[PDB]
Scaffold this motif. Structure first.
Motif, mmCIF file in Angstrom:
data_model
loop_
_atom_site.group_PDB
_atom_site.id
_atom_site.type_symbol
_atom_site.label_atom_id
_atom_site.label_comp_id
_atom_site.label_asym_id
_atom_site.label_seq_id
_atom_site.Cartn_x
_atom_site.Cartn_y
_atom_site.Cartn_z
ATOM 1 N N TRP A 636 -2.817 -0.389 2.600
ATOM 2 C CA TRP A 636 -1.527 -0.352 3.278
ATOM 3 C C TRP A 636 -0.440 0.205 2.375
ATOM 4 O O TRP A 636 0.510 0.830 2.856
ATOM 5 C CB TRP A 636 -1.146 -1.742 3.780
ATOM 6 C CG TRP A 636 -1.958 -2.168 4.936
ATOM 7 C CD1 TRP A 636 -3.013 -3.021 4.925
ATOM 8 C CD2 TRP A 636 -1.808 -1.728 6.285
ATOM 9 N NE1 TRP A 636 -3.522 -3.155 6.191
ATOM 10 C CE2 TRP A 636 -2.795 -2.367 7.043
ATOM 11 C CE3 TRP A 636 -0.925 -0.859 6.926
ATOM 12 C CZ2 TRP A 636 -2.925 -2.165 8.409
ATOM 13 C CZ3 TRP A 636 -1.055 -0.663 8.278
ATOM 14 C CH2 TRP A 636 -2.047 -1.313 9.006
ATOM 15 N N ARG A 640 2.019 3.254 2.938
ATOM 16 C CA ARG A 640 3.451 3.200 2.649
ATOM 17 C C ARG A 640 3.880 4.360 1.758
ATOM 18 O O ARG A 640 5.009 4.852 1.857
ATOM 19 C CB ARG A 640 3.814 1.865 1.994
ATOM 20 C CG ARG A 640 3.765 0.669 2.914
ATOM 21 C CD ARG A 640 3.984 -0.621 2.146
ATOM 22 N NE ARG A 640 3.837 -1.789 3.008
ATOM 23 C CZ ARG A 640 3.828 -3.043 2.570
ATOM 24 N NH1 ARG A 640 3.944 -3.298 1.277
ATOM 25 N NH2 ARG A 640 3.685 -4.046 3.424
ATOM 26 N N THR A 643 3.771 7.473 4.141
ATOM 27 C CA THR A 643 4.846 7.474 5.125
ATOM 28 C C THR A 643 6.163 7.879 4.476
ATOM 29 O O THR A 643 6.947 8.635 5.061
ATOM 30 C CB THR A 643 4.968 6.093 5.778
ATOM 31 O OG1 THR A 643 3.712 5.737 6.366
ATOM 32 C CG2 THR A 643 6.039 6.082 6.865
ATOM 33 N N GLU B 84 12.599 5.860 10.140
ATOM 34 C CA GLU B 84 11.400 6.459 9.569
ATOM 35 C C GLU B 84 10.153 5.722 10.035
ATOM 36 O O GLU B 84 9.081 6.316 10.183
ATOM 37 C CB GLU B 84 11.503 6.452 8.041
ATOM 38 C CG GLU B 84 10.406 7.210 7.305
ATOM 39 C CD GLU B 84 10.627 7.234 5.802
ATOM 40 O OE1 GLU B 84 11.603 6.613 5.334
ATOM 41 O OE2 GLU B 84 9.833 7.882 5.088
ATOM 42 N N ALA B 88 7.272 7.230 12.602
ATOM 43 C CA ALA B 88 5.900 7.153 12.116
ATOM 44 C C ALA B 88 4.974 6.542 13.158
ATOM 45 O O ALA B 88 3.837 6.988 13.329
ATOM 46 C CB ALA B 88 5.843 6.344 10.820
ATOM 47 N N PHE B 92 1.604 7.986 15.091
ATOM 48 C CA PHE B 92 0.371 7.249 14.830
ATOM 49 C C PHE B 92 -0.276 6.827 16.140
ATOM 50 O O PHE B 92 -1.479 7.019 16.336
ATOM 51 C CB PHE B 92 0.622 6.013 13.958
ATOM 52 C CG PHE B 92 0.955 6.315 12.517
ATOM 53 C CD1 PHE B 92 0.825 7.595 11.997
ATOM 54 C CD2 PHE B 92 1.380 5.301 11.673
ATOM 55 C CE1 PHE B 92 1.137 7.860 10.674
ATOM 56 C CE2 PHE B 92 1.684 5.559 10.349
ATOM 57 C CZ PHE B 92 1.562 6.839 9.850
ATOM 58 N N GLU B 139 5.974 -4.443 16.342
ATOM 59 C CA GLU B 139 6.627 -5.479 15.552
ATOM 60 C C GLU B 139 5.798 -5.834 14.322
ATOM 61 O O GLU B 139 6.336 -6.149 13.256
ATOM 62 C CB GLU B 139 6.872 -6.714 16.422
ATOM 63 C CG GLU B 139 7.639 -7.822 15.722
ATOM 64 C CD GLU B 139 7.878 -9.020 16.609
ATOM 65 O OE1 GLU B 139 7.423 -9.002 17.769
ATOM 66 O OE2 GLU B 139 8.521 -9.981 16.142
ATOM 67 N N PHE B 141 3.816 -3.617 12.926
ATOM 68 C CA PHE B 141 3.810 -2.395 12.129
ATOM 69 C C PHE B 141 5.040 -2.316 11.235
ATOM 70 O O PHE B 141 4.974 -1.799 10.115
ATOM 71 C CB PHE B 141 3.739 -1.188 13.060
ATOM 72 C CG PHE B 141 3.681 0.130 12.355
ATOM 73 C CD1 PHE B 141 2.492 0.594 11.822
ATOM 74 C CD2 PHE B 141 4.815 0.916 12.247
ATOM 75 C CE1 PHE B 141 2.440 1.817 11.187
ATOM 76 C CE2 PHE B 141 4.772 2.133 11.610
ATOM 77 C CZ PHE B 141 3.586 2.585 11.079
ATOM 78 N N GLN B 143 6.547 -4.963 10.076
ATOM 79 C CA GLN B 143 6.286 -6.049 9.138
ATOM 80 C C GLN B 143 5.472 -5.586 7.932
ATOM 81 O O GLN B 143 5.653 -6.093 6.819
ATOM 82 C CB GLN B 143 5.567 -7.189 9.868
ATOM 83 C CG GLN B 143 5.342 -8.437 9.039
ATOM 84 C CD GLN B 143 6.636 -9.118 8.663
ATOM 85 O OE1 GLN B 143 7.535 -9.265 9.487
ATOM 86 N NE2 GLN B 143 6.744 -9.526 7.405
ATOM 87 N N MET B 144 4.597 -4.603 8.129
ATOM 88 C CA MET B 144 3.790 -4.090 7.030
ATOM 89 C C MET B 144 4.447 -2.898 6.350
ATOM 90 O O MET B 144 3.772 -2.116 5.675
ATOM 91 C CB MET B 144 2.403 -3.710 7.530
ATOM 92 C CG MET B 144 1.610 -4.894 8.008
ATOM 93 S SD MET B 144 1.340 -6.115 6.717
ATOM 94 C CE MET B 144 0.204 -5.234 5.655
ATOM 95 N N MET B 145 5.755 -2.731 6.536
ATOM 96 C CA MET B 145 6.469 -1.694 5.801
ATOM 97 C C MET B 145 7.527 -2.298 4.890
ATOM 98 O O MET B 145 7.513 -2.078 3.674
ATOM 99 C CB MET B 145 7.098 -0.702 6.776
ATOM 100 C CG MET B 145 6.074 0.067 7.564
ATOM 101 S SD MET B 145 5.024 1.032 6.470
ATOM 102 C CE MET B 145 3.715 1.483 7.583
#
Ligand SMILES: CCCCCCCC/C=C\CCCCCCCC(=O)OC[C@H](COP(=O)(O)OCC[N+](C)(C)C)OC(=O)CCCCCCC/C=C\CCCCCCCC
Ligand SMILES: CCCCCCCC/C=C\CCCCCCCC(=O)OC[C@H](COP(=O)(O)OCC[N+](C)(C)C)OC(=O)CCCCCCC/C=C\CCCCCCCC
Ligand SMILES: CCCCCCCC/C=C\CCCCCCCC(=O)OC[C@H](COP(=O)(O)OCC[N+](C)(C)C)OC(=O)CCCCCCC/C=C\CCCCCCCC
Ligand SMILES: CCCCCCCC/C=C\CCCCCCCC(=O)OC[C@H](COP(=O)(O)OCC[N+](C)(C)C)OC(=O)CCCCCCC/C=C\CCCCCCCC
Ligand SMILES: CCCCCCCC/C=C\CCCCCCCC(=O)OC[C@H](COP(=O)(O)OCC[N+](C)(C)C)OC(=O)CCCCCCC/C=C\CCCCCCCC
Ligand SMILES: CCCCCCCC/C=C\CCCCCCCC(=O)OC[C@H](COP(=O)(O)OCC[N+](C)(C)C)OC(=O)CCCCCCC/C=C\CCCCCCCC
Ligand SMILES: CC(C)CCC[C@@H](C)[C@H]1CC[C@H]2[C@@H]3CC=C4C[C@@H](OC(=O)CCC(=O)O)CC[C@]4(C)[C@H]3CC[C@]12C
Ligand SMILES: CC(C)CCC[C@@H](C)[C@H]1CC[C@H]2[C@@H]3CC=C4C[C@@H](OC(=O)CCC(=O)O)CC[C@]4(C)[C@H]3CC[C@]12C
Ligand SMILES: CC(C)CCC[C@@H](C)[C@H]1CC[C@H]2[C@@H]3CC=C4C[C@@H](OC(=O)CCC(=O)O)CC[C@]4(C)[C@H]3CC[C@]12C
Ligand SMILES: CC(C)CCC[C@@H](C)[C@H]1CC[C@H]2[C@@H]3CC=C4C[C@@H](OC(=O)CCC(=O)O)CC[C@]4(C)[C@H]3CC[C@]12C
Ligand SMILES: CC(C)CCC[C@@H](C)[C@H]1CC[C@H]2[C@@H]3CC=C4C[C@@H](OC(=O)CCC(=O)O)CC[C@]4(C)[C@H]3CC[C@]12C
Ligand SMILES: CC(C)CCC[C@@H](C)[C@H]1CC[C@H]2[C@@H]3CC=C4C[C@@H](O)CC[C@]4(C)[C@H]3CC[C@]12C
Ligand SMILES: CC(C)CCC[C@@H](C)[C@H]1CC[C@H]2[C@@H]3CC=C4C[C@@H](O)CC[C@]4(C)[C@H]3CC[C@]12C
Ligand SMILES: [Ca+2]
Ligand SMILES: [Ca+2]
Ligand SMILES: [Ca+2]
Ligand SMILES: [Ca+2]
Ligand SMILES: [Ca+2]
Lengths: 644, 148, 612
Positions: A636, A640, A643, B84, B88, B92, B139, B141, B143-145
């Motif tokens: 992940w 990141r 992205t 961003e 994305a 995806f 939501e 997705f 959270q994992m950024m």
């Protein structure tokens, strides 16, 4: 190509005519003071045109000037009518522009001025083409439904729009919502547009009328690959029979999906279309269970009986080519006595022994088998098409061609046997390698052999074809180089390069490393030879044959979930083919009928399933009512970084 | 309720769906009664009557999807996400169902090299899978950024 | 297949009988007004049936109508009894439906009407099959425990349920909780159901009674691969001795895990089952340390002594095949003098020299070794099975077959030597390539060679078998094509294709590129030949042999953590085999006994660790 050059010259000319007109420039910016000075004159040219054949009201609506547009309607009410008269934006009224810009006050002002809500924007800039970036339709209701404005759609219906407006393609409003790139908000409008129908008796409700291709809104979602619209249209065609704890039993309607289909039915539309996004509808809720019940029950046994009849056909043809007639050589060896080895030839009156009467039975099995191929395959090529779309059915592709070329080469051998022609080796030796390699067609009904036969096809039209252009470059350069080196020397101690057709066939084999390589070790080879063959073996064997394995190995893991989607679509194409050509005495119709169960005359397929019980989801939405790990988290961060 | 983006309507549509276990667009007091009993609660028949009648604007007595969409915009928790991340996610997500899948993180990882086994693709799913359907939301997705 | 066709016709017929009945349709929606109009009549058919043999109370419970169901109980109290009488849903009462729908008011209303809490839903739609989507059990306590309703389980016990209810499979309530797809909430119910036992003396507590396969709830979690239930059942079988800072010393109980096991013990259940989710219990807390202490201490030395006895056995057999008797050719060469090269043949009275008396010792070592194989392997094939489940033990697989086929081909050579038959080359040349390639069995006890021998097996039954179907398609097409081209020509200047059995054996080798390729360069080959061989070499060498390397290379990194789990299970299968067949004088029993330490008669294994 020159049309886009001509279209760009139109847009620059429109900006010229605005600047070169005191009305159109003042209507462009806002200039509400400047309009009152001009329009109070005598001949202030209210029906002035431009490059797009637009008026001053078209300009004020395009650049979103509410204040200037009302001044134009007060001084000249005739401009609410009179659409653009150019070829490009033909028929587009000022109401169309206010709707696409999603203006609320300008639309309501135009409807007070008796605007036409049933005009047609029938120009070449609104038609469904790859040149245009949008396909909105022709009517103002079609424009408001595609820019997602529920206020203007409700406003247009109250002023007397038509809910059944059809284009030049025949598409209704509901067809256009499917062709839009925003799938989720198209579903929200689709419920709204049917809600205002509610009196559409007409002997055609609303979402059953087709366009000029015969496609309903349900089947148009099937062709265009709208997975979101397809699941939304399944709500109408199912019935929940009973819910027993965590166990529901739905009842889908196979009246527009199943290929009993005297009309064109949905499994034929998906499997013949060229889009790679329509093959994802073969995994949805009624269609995945429909294909499996056809393939497991009646699809696989009938496909393995045709695989065993064809295999005993191509053995009967093989033993007619092994036991084919030959006699010893008649006249002499006297063709020039150093390069002739043939010592038998073909016989004329072959059938004069009892051992050839068995073969005559075996050859009549072959020729009758070659006619039956040309009667079940050629009247689909010349009839359903003039060979415009025969090539890639799905990706299945060559096996249409290999079974026609087989049935042609058998009938060439029939002609050469009757007129007693000389060379029958040439039509046979095609007909065997075409004949046995067509057994690979029947490897699509086995999961072990299925996805491997697709990867053979995706290399021949791909990573092997681009290698054989850069192989024929090399073995024309070196074979013409090796030829002139041994041109001045002795062609029996090393005769790999004595003819130029033979020097092309040696270097083709030395590239493949299937023959050894020219070496004599008794006589001194040319000094130039050892240089130019060591140059050759590096860029044949060490570089380019180790670059196929690096390239086929790179491809094989990239297309490794596409070839599994291609195999599940080869079963559907096989199943629909077996259903169509076989009679109705075999192959019972799928699903349970509804005559003796009080459901009508249509055909149903029930599916029961155990769904879940996910507590954390259902508890969060319930309160809203009220009165292995370590390298995964490494991935992940790799996303990141990608992205960012 | 015209403030809601593309991914939220796709979340709320199936959220409407697992309430409505008869395949239409009507939440009667029955289907909300079947949910609240499955939560282990004892639904008061007055409580079942109030919660439907509280948000039902048309007055038919059954909550449809635009009224369930109107209620959920009231009781929206919040989201303050980034440009961003949203751009994305829309690239995806391919079919536009509002969900990234296990079949659609294979495509993103093959796009930048990154040889995953199909087991390791599902091992990525369950880390981002907050609630659980084998799919990552929008939501989840976000959270994992912004975790770092 | 036709049963699912018949089951779908049952469900559509049930919806027909409801619509064609004024009682059942009114009980379906809710129609509390309509029931009072019908049930006040004289003959209003209270024992009416349907397709599933259901009553009006079964319908009102199935579609969750509390209001209509109470009206049916008031007008006819006999409908609380009388279960469904169809074949599919046999025995299912109205109490069963209210429990699965997880209704709280309808269950309590039925228990006031003296419902049967010990009925059996013994239909074909509740049995454990792949056809059914659920396996809930037979009893109402089994239904409430699987839909996770702790209110109804507590309600059913207070009204006199039976905690030891067994199915037609013999499964108790605790067995059914293991077979459920939600592992975490099954653990929460498992503590609840034992909590209400608490008086189960019975000479069998509660979670020690087996089903009809002899499996306790502890061993059934081992077979079915419930990793979550397995760790939950370890809490009962450990004892923390002492905690010294960051250092604890637990004491696991090897009374149902260790394969001393005159009964069927857990290491035999896991290693013989077919599920790929049971092999994850070989990495848990007592089992991983148990196998390593067996394999390092007594498993590896005894496996490398059998690897050295077998290797000196197959050398003694090899030198009996090298020094085998031959005499020169007796009669004549006069077999047709252009195609015969054999010049020796087999001897009859071989043993008449001192150099053959050494070989007779070496052959009696071989034949006795071939009998011992057929006495330790064949009485497990004909006894424990009728060859129904011998094939894939774990994935280990062929080495059962290769050691039987070796011991058969030695005994064929014994028969042909005694009756003095002609061809002994055929039974020997099988027996050597079967004999030496069985040394690959002994490469599972070495980590260097272990996971590589599994990948040889997963290619032969896989990415090499699917290539050899599409190789035999090609070399039947081209070999029959090359044969007819050189059929009309001279078979000594280029004789690769003179017979059809020889043309199949040339094209098999030209596909593999192991022989060179037909070329003479002195005589003019057929013009059709150079076309059809250039067509052949592209789709043999450039396409399809470079597509094995792309396919075996793609597979080898995908199954690259499965073959490491397969190797750690080949050690467990080897260890249990060595423990069973060897006597008890060798191989001491694992773990420390508890007689002289005041712990009973069972066997313990302590493990200490530093946690965090
Ligand atoms: C020769 C004449 C006689 C030969 C066969 C007699 C009739 C055979 C067909 C009868 C129908 C019944 C049937 O179903 O028979 C087809 C079987 C299916 O295979 P399966 O058992 O694995 O299906 C189970 C797969 N599961 C276990 C993964 C779920 O397959 C088979 O017997 C194969 C039958 C022959 C097919 C050869 C066609 C040419 C293929 C070339 C490949 C390159
Ligand atoms: C529906 C489509 C099928 C219809 C029926 C099929 C064809 C039958 C009808 C007519 C027969 C014509 C076919 C053959 C044409 C030439 C006949 C011929 O010339 O004679 C046939 C030969 C007999 O030899 P001979 O008469 O020359 O005299 C002895 C020669 N001498 C002395 C050297 C030994 O027959 C042989 O050789 C047999 C040896 C071939 C090996 C086995 C054949 C098949 C192999 C496998 C079948 C199953 C595999 C899985 C599927
Ligand atoms: C699927 C992807 C791959 C498909 C594309 C592959 C394209 C290449 C394949 C084939 C190329 C055709 C070449 C045919 C040449 C044979 C001509 C012939 O039959 O006569 C041979 C003659 C001389 O031979 P000789 O021994 O009888 O006289 C000896 C001289 N004396 C009389 C003094 C003793 O030599 C000559 O004509 C020499 C003429 C030289 C021209 C060769 C190049 C022609 C083609 C170029 C296109 C390739 C572009 C892309 C790579
Ligand atoms: C009557 C003859 C038998 C008497 C003596 C022969 C030697 C067998 C007994 C000696 C002890 C065997 C042993 O304990 O070790 C076997 C060694 C490998 O060394 P290691 O396992 O101790 O590694 C160190 C691992 N650490 C550090 C954890 C300890 O290798 C070996 O002698 C293996 C001996 C031959 C194995 C035959 C297998 C055939 C090969 C198949 C390949 C395909
Ligand atoms: C565990 C249970 C199975 C084994 C149990 C042992 C039983 C042994 C009994 C028989 C063995 C079977 C062999 C059958 C044929 C033997 C050859 C033969 O019958 O003729 C004997 C020849 C020539 O003898 P000679 O002329 O010198 O007179 C002999 C006078 N005398 C012995 C006093 C020096 O002797 C020769 O065997 C030729 C020399 C052989 C070349 C080396 C072979 C061994 C190499 C490697 C093996 C170990 C590798 C481990 C890693
Ligand atoms: C476990 C996975 C394994 C994957 C591989 C699948 C197994 C099949 C592979 C290879 C096929 C093996 C069968 C071999 C055929 C036996 C032919 C034979 O040995 O007989 C000899 C005869 C004639 O011999 P001749 O030279 O003396 O007469 C010369 C003529 N004169 C006297 C006029 C001069 O030849 C004949 O009749 C030829 C008759 C036609 C044979 C073609 C079909 C045979 C096999 C069909 C099944 C393939 C399915 C693939 C999917
Ligand atoms: C004279 C006696 C021995 C009867 C022999 C009949 C069969 C050997 C032949 C006759 C017609 C043939 C069929 C003609 C047409 C087709 C469709 C054809 O379809 C495709 O090629 C689809 C894939 C693609 O798109 O390329 C595949 C072979 C098949 C089934 C053929 C299979 C073999 C058949 C049944
Ligand atoms: C990038 C290359 C240089 C890789 C390194 C490999 C070298 C060790 C090879 C490749 C080229 C070879 C040379 C190519 C050409 C010749 C000339 C050749 O001619 C002769 O002198 C004898 C005459 C004859 O052979 O006909 C002898 C071998 C030699 C030196 C070869 C020796 C070995 C070489 C240097
Ligand atoms: C005169 C003397 C030398 C007799 C020879 C005795 C040994 C050389 C033989 C006799 C019994 C044999 C054993 C019989 C049974 C087995 C189990 C067998 O296991 C399997 O078949 C593999 C299991 C699977 O399929 O996964 C492997 C060979 C082995 C150890 C054999 C190894 C060789 C042994 C010890
Ligand atoms: C073993 C499987 C998984 C691979 C695919 C099978 C075929 C592609 C190959 C392997 C076994 C081969 C056969 C093995 C034995 C023989 C007998 C042998 O025939 C002869 O007796 C003629 C040659 C001679 O006499 O020397 C050689 C050809 C043939 C049919 C071979 C032809 C090619 C076959 C069928
Ligand atoms: C897929 C292919 C087109 C990629 C590039 C390879 C070609 C350069 C090869 C493939 C087929 C070959 C041909 C196959 C057959 C023949 C006939 C043969 O010529 C003869 O008749 C014999 C020689 C003589 O006249 O002595 C050898 C040359 C030629 C034209 C070959 C020349 C080289 C070709 C065109
Ligand atoms: C020139 C003569 C002698 C023989 C030529 C052979 C050629 C034309 C034939 C024989 C083998 C054939 C291929 C065999 C396998 C496949 C894979 C399949 O999924 C599609 C067809 C495809 C791609 C075939 C295309 C045509 C093909 C390449
Ligand atoms: C025809 C005769 C002469 C040759 C006999 C060859 C056969 C019987 C033998 C030779 C080599 C053997 C293979 C060697 C390696 C492996 C990998 C191992 O993990 C399982 C057994 C397996 C898959 C064997 C299966 C049987 C096998 C293919
Ligand atoms: Ca509902
Ligand atoms: Ca409503
Ligand atoms: Ca998606
Ligand atoms: Ca989720
Ligand atoms: Ca060679």
């Amino acid at each position: 190509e020159s049309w886009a050059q001509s279209r760009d010259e139109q847009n620059l000319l429109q900006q010229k005519r605005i600047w070169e007109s005191p009305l159109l420039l003042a209507a462009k910016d806002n200039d509400v003071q400047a309009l009152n000075k001009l329009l109070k004159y005598e001949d202030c040219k209210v029906h002035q045109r431009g490059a797009m054949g637009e008026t001053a009201l078209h300009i004020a609506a395009l650049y979103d000037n509410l204040e200037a547009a009302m001044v134009l309607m007060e001084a000249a009410p005739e401009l609410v009518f009179e659409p653009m008269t150019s070829e490009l934006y033909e028929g587009q009224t000022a109401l169309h522009i206010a709707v696409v810009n999603q203006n609320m006050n300008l639309v309501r002002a135009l409807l007070a001025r008796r605007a036409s809500v049933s005009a047609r924007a029938t120009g070449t800039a609104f038609r469904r083409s790859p040149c245009n970036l949008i396909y909105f339709g022709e009517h103002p209701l079609s424009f408001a439904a595609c820019v997602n404005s529920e206020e203007i759609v409700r406003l247009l219906i109250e002023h007397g729009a038509d809910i059944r407006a059809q284009d030049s393609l025949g598409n209704t409003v509901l067809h256009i919502l499917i062709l839009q790139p925003n799938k989720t908000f198209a579903c929200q409008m689709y419920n709204l547009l049917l809600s205002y129908d509610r009196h559409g008796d007409h002997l055609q409700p609303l979402d059953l009328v087709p366009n000029h291709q015969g496609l309903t809104p349900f089947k148009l979602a099937g062709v265009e690959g709208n997975t979101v619209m397809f699941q939304h249209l399944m709500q109408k065609r199912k019935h929940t029979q009973w819910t027993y704890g965590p166990l529901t039993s739905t009842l889908y309607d196979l009246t527009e999906i199943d290929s009993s289909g005297d009309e064109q039915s949905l499994l034929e539309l998906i499997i013949t279309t060229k889009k790679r996004e329509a093959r994802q509808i073969l995994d949805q809720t009624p269609v995945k269970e429909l294909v499996s019940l056809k393939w497991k029950r009646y699809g696989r046994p009938y496909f393995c009986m045709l695989g065993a009849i064809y295999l005993l056909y191509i053995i009967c043809f093989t033993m007619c080519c092994i036991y084919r007639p030959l006699k010893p050589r008649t006249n002499n060896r006297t063709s020039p006595r150093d390069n002739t080895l043939l010592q038998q030839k073909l016989l004329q009156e072959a059938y004069m022994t009892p051992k050839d009467d068995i073969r005559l039975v075996g050859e009549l099995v072959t020729v009758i088998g070659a006619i039956i191929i040309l009667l079940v395959e050629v009247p689909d090529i010349f009839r359903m098409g003039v060979t415009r779309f025969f090539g890639q059915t799905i990706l299945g592709g060559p096996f249409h061609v290999l079974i026609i070329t087989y049935a042609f080469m058998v009938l060439v051998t029939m002609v050469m046997r009757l007129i007693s022609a000389s060379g029958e080796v040439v039509p046979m030796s095609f007909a065997l390698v075409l004949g046995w390699c067509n057994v690979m067609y029947f490897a699509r009904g086995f999961q072990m052999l299925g996805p491997f036969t697709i990867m053979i096809q995706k290399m021949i039209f791909g990573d092997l074809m681009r290698f054989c252009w850069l192989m024929a470059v090399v073995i024309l350069g070196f074979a013409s180089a090796f030829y002139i080196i041994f041109q001045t020397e002795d062609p029996e101690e090393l005769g790999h390069f004595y003819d130029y057709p033979m020097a092309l066939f040696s270097t083709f084999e030395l590239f493949l490393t299937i023959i050894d390589g020219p070496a004599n070790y008794n006589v001194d080879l040319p000094f130039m030879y050892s240089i130019t063959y060591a140059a050759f073996a590096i860029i044949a064997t060490l570089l380019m044959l180790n670059l196929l394995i690096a390239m086929m190995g790179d491809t094989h893991w990239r297309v490794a979930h596409e070839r599994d989607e291609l195999w599940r679509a080869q079963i559907v194409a096989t199943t629909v083919m077996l259903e169509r050509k076989l009679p109705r005495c075999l192959w019972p119709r799928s699903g349970i009928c509804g005559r003796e169960y009080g459901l009508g005359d249509r055909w149903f397929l029930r599916v029961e399933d155990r769904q879940d019980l996910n507590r954390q989801r259902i508890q969060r939405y319930a309160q809203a009512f009220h009165t292995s790990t370590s390298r995964s988290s490494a991935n992940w961060e790799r996303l990141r970084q990608g992205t960012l | 309720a015209d403030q809601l983006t593309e991914e939220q309507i796709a979340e709320f549509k199936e959220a409407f769906s697992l309430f409505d276990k008869d395949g239409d667009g009507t939440i009667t007091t029955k289907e909300l009664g079947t949910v609240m009993r499955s939560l282990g609660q004892n639904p008061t028949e007055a409580e079942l009557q109030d919660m439907i009648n509280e948000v039902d604007a048309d007055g038919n007595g059954t909550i449809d999807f635009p009224e369930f969409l109107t209620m959920m915009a009231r009781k929206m928790k919040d989201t303050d996400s980034e440009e961003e991340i949203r751009e994305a996610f829309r690239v995806f997500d391919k079919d536009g169902n509002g969900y990234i899948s296990a079949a659609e993180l294979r495509h993103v990882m093959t796009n930048l090299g990154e040889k995953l086994t199909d087991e390791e693709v599902d091992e990525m799913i369950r880390e981002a899978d907050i609630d659980g359907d084998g799919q990552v939301n929008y939501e989840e997705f976000v959270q994992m950024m912004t975790a770092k």
